[PDB]
Amino acid sequence: RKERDFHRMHHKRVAQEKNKLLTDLRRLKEHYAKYEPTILELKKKYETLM
Amino acid sequence: WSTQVFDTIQGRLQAAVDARDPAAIESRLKTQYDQYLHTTNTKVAVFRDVIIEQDYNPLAAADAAIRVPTGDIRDPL
Amino acid sequence: RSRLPVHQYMTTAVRTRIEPLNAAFTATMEARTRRLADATRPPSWPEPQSISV
Amino acid sequence: MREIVHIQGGQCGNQIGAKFWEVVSDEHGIDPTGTYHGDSDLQLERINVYFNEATGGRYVPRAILMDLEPGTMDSVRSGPYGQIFRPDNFVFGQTGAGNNWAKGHYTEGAELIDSVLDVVRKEAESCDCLQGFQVCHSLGGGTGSGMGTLLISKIREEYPDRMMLTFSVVPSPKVSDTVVEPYNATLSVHQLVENADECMVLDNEALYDICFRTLKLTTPTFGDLNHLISAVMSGITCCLRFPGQLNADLRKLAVNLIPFPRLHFFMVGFTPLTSRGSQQYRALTVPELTQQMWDAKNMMCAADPRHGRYLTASALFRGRMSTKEVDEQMLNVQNKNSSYFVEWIPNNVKSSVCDIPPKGLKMSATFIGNSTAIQEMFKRVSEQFTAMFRRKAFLHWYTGEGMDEMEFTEAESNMNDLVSEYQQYQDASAE
Amino acid sequence: MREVISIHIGQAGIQVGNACWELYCLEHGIQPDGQMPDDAFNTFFSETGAGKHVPRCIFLDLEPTVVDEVRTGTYRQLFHPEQLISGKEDAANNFARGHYTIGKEIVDLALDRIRKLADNCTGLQGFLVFNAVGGGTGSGLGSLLLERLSVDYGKKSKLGFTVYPSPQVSTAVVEPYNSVLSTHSLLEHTDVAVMLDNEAIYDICRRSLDIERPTYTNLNRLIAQVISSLTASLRFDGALNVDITEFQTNLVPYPRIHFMLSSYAPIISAEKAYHEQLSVAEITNAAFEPASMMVKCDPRHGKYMACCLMYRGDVVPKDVNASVATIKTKRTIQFVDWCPTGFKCGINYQPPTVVPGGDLAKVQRAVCMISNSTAIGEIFSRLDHKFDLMYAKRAFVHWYVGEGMEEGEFSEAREDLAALEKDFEEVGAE
Amino acid sequence: MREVISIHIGQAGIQVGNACWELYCLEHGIQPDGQMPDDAFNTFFSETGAGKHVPRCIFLDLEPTVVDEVRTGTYRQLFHPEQLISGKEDAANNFARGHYTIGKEIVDLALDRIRKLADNCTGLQGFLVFNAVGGGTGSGLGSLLLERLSVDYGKKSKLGFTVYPSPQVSTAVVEPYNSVLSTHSLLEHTDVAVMLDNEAIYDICRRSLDIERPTYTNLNRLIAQVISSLTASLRFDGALNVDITEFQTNLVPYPRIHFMLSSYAPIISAEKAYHEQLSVAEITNAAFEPASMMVKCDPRHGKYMACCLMYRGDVVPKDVNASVATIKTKRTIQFVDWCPTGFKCGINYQPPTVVPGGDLAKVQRAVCMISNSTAIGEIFSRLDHKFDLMYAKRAFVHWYVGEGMEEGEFSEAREDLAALEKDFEEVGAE
Ligand SMILES: Nc1nc2c(ncn2[C@@H]2O[C@H](COP(=O)(O)OP(=O)(O)OP(=O)(O)O)[C@@H](O)[C@H]2O)c(=O)[nH]1
Numbered sequence A: 001r002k003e004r005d006f007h008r009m010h011h012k013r014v015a016q017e018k019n020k021l022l023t024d025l026r027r028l029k030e031h032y033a034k035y036e037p038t039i040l041e042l043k044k045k046y047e048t049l050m
Numbered sequence B: 001w002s003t004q005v006f007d008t009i010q011g012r013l014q015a016a017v018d019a020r021d022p023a024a025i026e027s028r029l030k031t032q033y034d035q036y037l038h039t040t041n042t043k044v045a046v047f048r049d050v051i052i053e054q055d056y057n058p059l060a061a062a063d064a065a066i067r068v069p070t071g072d073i074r075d076p077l
Numbered sequence C: 001r002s003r004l005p006v007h008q009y010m011t012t013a014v015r016t017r018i019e020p021l022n023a024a025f026t027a028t029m030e031a032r033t034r035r036l037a038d039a040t041r042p043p044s045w046p047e048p049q050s051i052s053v
Numbered sequence D: 001m002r003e004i005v006h007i008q009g010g011q012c013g014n015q016i017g018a019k020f021w022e023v024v025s026d027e028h029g030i031d032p033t034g035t036y037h038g039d040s041d042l043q044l045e046r047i048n049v050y051f052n053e054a055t056g057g058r059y060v061p062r063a064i065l066m067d068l069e070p071g072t073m074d075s076v077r078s079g080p081y082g083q084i085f086r087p088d089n090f091v092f093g094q095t096g097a098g099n100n101w102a103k104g105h106y107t108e109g110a111e112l113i114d115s116v117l118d119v120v121r122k123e124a125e126s127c128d129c130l131q132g133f134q135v136c137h138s139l140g141g142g143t144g145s146g147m148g149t150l151l152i153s154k155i156r157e158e159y160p161d162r163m164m165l166t167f168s169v170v171p172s173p174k175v176s177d178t179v180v181e182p183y184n185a186t187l188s189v190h191q192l193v194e195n196a197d198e199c200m201v202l203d204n205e206a207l208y209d210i211c212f213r214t215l216k217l218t219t220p221t222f223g224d225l226n227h228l229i230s231a232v233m234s235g236i237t238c239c240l241r242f243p244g245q246l247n248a249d250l251r252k253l254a255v256n257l258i259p260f261p262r263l264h265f266f267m268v269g270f271t272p273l274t275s276r277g278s279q280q281y282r283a284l285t286v287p288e289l290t291q292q293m294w295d296a297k298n299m300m301c302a303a304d305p306r307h308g309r310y311l312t313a314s315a316l317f318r319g320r321m322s323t324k325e326v327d328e329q330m331l332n333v334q335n336k337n338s339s340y341f342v343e344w345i346p347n348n349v350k351s352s353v354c355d356i357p358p359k360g361l362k363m364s365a366t367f368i369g370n371s372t373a374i375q376e377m378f379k380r381v382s383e384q385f386t387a388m389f390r391r392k393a394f395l396h397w398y399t400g401e402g403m404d405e406m407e408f409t410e411a412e413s414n415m416n417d418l419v420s421e422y423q424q425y426q427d428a429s430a431e
Numbered sequence E, F: 001m002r003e004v005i006s007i008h009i010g011q012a013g014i015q016v017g018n019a020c021w022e023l024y025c026l027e028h029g030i031q032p033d034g035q036m037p038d039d040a041f042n043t044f045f046s047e048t049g050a051g052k053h054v055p056r057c058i059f060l061d062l063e064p065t066v067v068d069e070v071r072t073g074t075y076r077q078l079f080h081p082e083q084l085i086s087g088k089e090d091a092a093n094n095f096a097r098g099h100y101t102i103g104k105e106i107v108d109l110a111l112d113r114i115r116k117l118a119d120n121c122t123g124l125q126g127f128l129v130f131n132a133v134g135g136g137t138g139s140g141l142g143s144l145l146l147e148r149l150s151v152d153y154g155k156k157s158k159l160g161f162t163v164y165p166s167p168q169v170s171t172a173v174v175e176p177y178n179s180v181l182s183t184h185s186l187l188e189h190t191d192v193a194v195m196l197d198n199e200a201i202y203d204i205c206r207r208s209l210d211i212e213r214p215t216y217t218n219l220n221r222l223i224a225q226v227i228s229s230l231t232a233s234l235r236f237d238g239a240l241n242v243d244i245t246e247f248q249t250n251l252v253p254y255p256r257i258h259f260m261l262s263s264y265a266p267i268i269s270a271e272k273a274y275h276e277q278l279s280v281a282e283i284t285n286a287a288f289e290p291a292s293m294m295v296k297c298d299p300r301h302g303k304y305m306a307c308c309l310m311y312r313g314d315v316v317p318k319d320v321n322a323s324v325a326t327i328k329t330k331r332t333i334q335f336v337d338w339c340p341t342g343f344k345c346g347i348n349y350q351p352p353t354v355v356p357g358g359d360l361a362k363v364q365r366a367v368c369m370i371s372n373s374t375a376i377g378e379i380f381s382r383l384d385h386k387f388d389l390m391y392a393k394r395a396f397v398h399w400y401v402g403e404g405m406e407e408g409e410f411s412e413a414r415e416d417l418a419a420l421e422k423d424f425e426e427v428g429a430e
């Protein structure tokens, strides 16, 4: 039981850290999907200019 | 959670509420309420937590209630 | 017997007040109607079986 | 220059926040009209932490009031310090949430949350540097808990790095006010675990017990409990506002307190809480304040620390004291009560000192303890939630507000997992 | 902002409305002429160009006598002349007459005026329907109006303060008939139905008020005090504010189980006043006494599901908490296993105003305890055999058939009440 | 904090309680209306918010006349109207009537009011039950009430100040019968029973007060003074404070033996007052004189087991100890061999107040001696043959049988009283 509890908390804390990384990844992805349409619009203006 | 706890408890509630005949329920509640009516009409006053539990014992109604046992829970685990 | 469960019976007033409860009541009615069809269907007559030697 | 955005939610939260702003204005020498009348340079030195300077000499609190019914903030505005707040910060609906977390989080909070976040963003962008947000509210209520969790989630999405501090009034163990308190608390704890970085747990009955056993009051209205909570809320952040011999900001407290992120629930206490009768009979010494601080009755939380184990404990003192005295006293406390302290953490004490005590008191001390005792409180909330949820009593309203019945299972599972964390780190052995 | 529309149907409805509106006028300072010498009246009154306050109420009746009593009485200049709606022929204690043949045009006009009243309200907490279960006007017309309101208005919370037949004493013969019919009608249309029994109120007047000769005016005064205590949180601020919409959320464990006992405390005359402490704990115990209940039903028979307390006056959250803790620890009062809290306490800073000429005394504390309990199925068991005993012989069935009813309708109503009995047994069960 | 619940059952109980409450009101300054122009009254009164003080008392009787005399007299605004409980048919000196047929509803209501009274008391020192052993109301109803109190309240100290039939003089015929019944009933319920005899109190009034025409009012005034002296330690502070719970442990040697002789001193008229020194030693000797006993029982026949003395006024422990030492050295006063101390002395700084219109003089010192002695078995010996002389012919037995008695009940009462005699002889013997 002692060994089981030790491995339980190691596994759980690792899983929690993985979930935190996933949330951070979501945040950055949203933050830069905000920027991407500006690049697309500049591309359209560039093409029209040529 | 549904199947382990709620389905089990509702299934045990049924086949007990269903088993109880409506006529028996009516007769039981009638005996109780007529006992209360008789003690109200005879005695000058009616008090809770003061009854003599001899002429009128209302708690028998609570005794004659469906009891359902318990199994196991998955959410609490 | 086969009375509709207490927690699932939405009165007309509650159904009018809360649309999702009305939808849940309609869904439960549909489910109870569906439950009869499976019982009424004769579950016998399994598929023809080919054995081989 | 490290600002804090205050938010009040629900009736209980709004009352407590109004009391807190009254206390802060008293500390900074701000009259209810906003003009400074404190006669102290230190008071205006860091007034920007809580207030902004208006067109004149008036100072407007950086507070945002939320409600779904107008009566509570009408009373707040009619109160002694109702005119300091900016009117644009009063965001109200028209139909109050009938103690329905589903109504306050999904149906009626959805439309008002846009205005709430707009005002919050307006207040946050004005800040040069933002320490974070503090939300004062009560678990076990519809609009309070619902809008608090919704706004906390929104602010967490917007400002992930900024500090989030919560003062949640958990429903009391013994005498409960509303029927659906376990439901509301179970739904709110799930959100608070995930979103709020730092959370204080408070109980009306624990406050009553402390006000009858320490303060020995006769007829304590809700105002007295709000005053005690306001004192704790001031003392937690007095280091930001006043120079300290050993200062500690909110992030420092969080770093030194939180061993693992999900175990961020803390019980708080304020010292010295002395009865009117024994004011002369007690002597203000650091050992006295420490002895009162480590008493189980001094906790504003129902869970008694004795059953659990202290994971961590911070003590923010205020006043002219010897850091040697403070450190020796708290080390002595740890050595004496080592059984009640977690073994695999060599020092469970985060002691901080500020040089400015609250008015009237020569010195004071606020205590913030992260102990495994709150496990029993969450266990009790579960013992009520399961009792109602096994029969789905009172559940049809929440089902009808557009939240799935599986969400209750989610919330109970998450809270029980938190209980498991507290128990296992209570019984965890070194090596 | 917090408007509530009041409807009074039948003689009993109109006569309890007289007391209710007298009580509200006395509470808000509104003179009977219509005007008073902030905005606390908006829940019940809308102010007009002259400054006159008109109540948001509708007095509906198929009999002209009861309404003409109001048209001639002291409250002739207060109510709106078209708000007082009078029929031509009485329902004659016939549910069919009041629901099928006579009531149609009257209820159409009623919906017209109700729409006019609702268009005068920014918000609308809901409806307060005051009728008499046990009479054609009260049962049939009230049921029809509730049906129409549920159809059109939708989400408005309809609270029906129904007066049900007393167990042994009664004044009508077809009272079980139309009571069962109206119970079937409002089992699905009202949101919270409050039970009242004249025999229980008579016993309350006989013992607590020491009135050996109680009458309808006395009964209606107690009922009006109960309703005003219920609505006090809408009009006056206080600690733990309580709301019309949250009556449901804190009180109705399941939509079927929405019939509610009511009990007022203290019920004491002037001579017996200022003679006892009348503390919060004592008045709460009195409210949970079986005698204080306004329905002839022993609470000890069943188990309480929920109890909402409305305190008025100098009440502190400690006092209410300690009183409720003592009540919970008390062994006689039994609650269900599935509702560990089962309590909704709400205090108001406005003490109950006393109607001059009444018997109730000026008490600085008052409690209105409204309880959802499974014991109430017992009075339903009484009416369920009072019905079927006559229904076996089909006594007075031709009277109901003549105005467009069927034997199937009586059977369906009685079967629905039997289903309600089964429901009460199940919810009391674990 | 030191509340004591007073019960007055039967005509004699109510009539001595009239004097008791007059004495208490005069002692505390409480005007008869109810309110007075710290917290020493809490033992006997609970004060209301308006300032009116209501006694924690209950006047129980099956006859309307005695209670209506209180309802009409000067103390009509003091007592609680519902506390005054009146029956319809008198017990007719029938124990069975007062205990089995008429008394049931009355004792039910009595327990209800007793519960309400005790719920208003933080602490509860005990009960003071005043009845007259020898009448259907006092005996039967008092026994039933005591049994119910023992069942529900349990360990609370019940002090029964019973008035027993005099040896030769009497006013009833079946008085030995119902006296034996009541003695059997209360042998197992009351914790401390105090014996009083009308003949002895009449002799006291004749010799000491020089009243050649003593009456019930004077007897009740004497009893009231005795009880006030007994309770003075609860309300007024003084050296050697004595408690009701202390009474049982310092006075009752064995559970069966709990009957006590009572004697007050001095009993002197104003004319004879200030004509003797009335020192502590002299008043103690007077209290120990056989003539001063309020029971027709010569203490010289038996041996004292315990003597609790309550001193009121200017009494110093040196004087009380010198007086008690002289008493112990006196050969006439004989104590049992197994109780060498046998003395429970207590002093109080509040002198006994004088009732205007009474015969007692204002004496700065007073002694109330309550003694447990084996001589009291003599009165039991008298009633045991007064019972059996009638019982051999079964006189008046059919009357008791008519309300549900059997010969077995009378036999059991007689056997239990014989057992009490045997216990008295056993404890008296070495
Ligand atoms: N508590 C109370 N009940 C009343 C009062 N007035 C009438 N009732 C009850 O109301 C019932 C009948 O009311 P209604 O149906 O409105 O009588 P109505 O106005 O002639 O109309 P119909 O009888 O239906 O034709 C009776 O059984 C009474 O018990 C009252 O003032 N107070």
Ligand SMILES: Nc1nc2c(ncn2[C@@H]2O[C@H](COP(=O)(O)OP(=O)(O)OP(=O)(O)O)[C@@H](O)[C@H]2O)c(=O)[nH]1
Residues within 6 Å of the ligand: F009, F010, F011, F012, F013, F015, F016, F061, F063, F090, F091, F092, F093, F094, F098, F132, F134, F135, F136, F137, F138, F139, F163, F171, F172, F175, F198, F216, F217, F219, F220
């Ligand atoms: N000390 C004292 N004893 C009294 C007084 N009045 C009556 N008694 C005694 O009380 C005895 C009977 O009392 P009760 O039983 O109460 O008389 P009651 O009220 O008519 O009731 P019943 O006789 O049983 O019907 C009589 O035998 C008297 O000796 C009194 O004023 N003082």
Ligand SMILES: Nc1nc2c(ncn2[C@@H]2O[C@H](COP(=O)(O)OP(=O)(O)O)[C@@H](O)[C@H]2O)c(=O)[nH]1
Residues within 6 Å of the ligand: D009, D010, D011, D012, D013, D015, D016, D096, D097, D098, D099, D138, D139, D140, D141, D142, D143, D144, D145, D169, D176, D177, D178, D204, D222, D223, D225, D226, E240
């Ligand atoms: N300390 C304190 N607690 C309160 C106050 N008012 C209400 N509460 C408690 O807060 C709990 C939750 O109520 P709340 O969430 O504000 O209700 P809501 O606004 O409708 O959501 C209730 O159970 C009350 O007991 C107050 O002024 N001070």
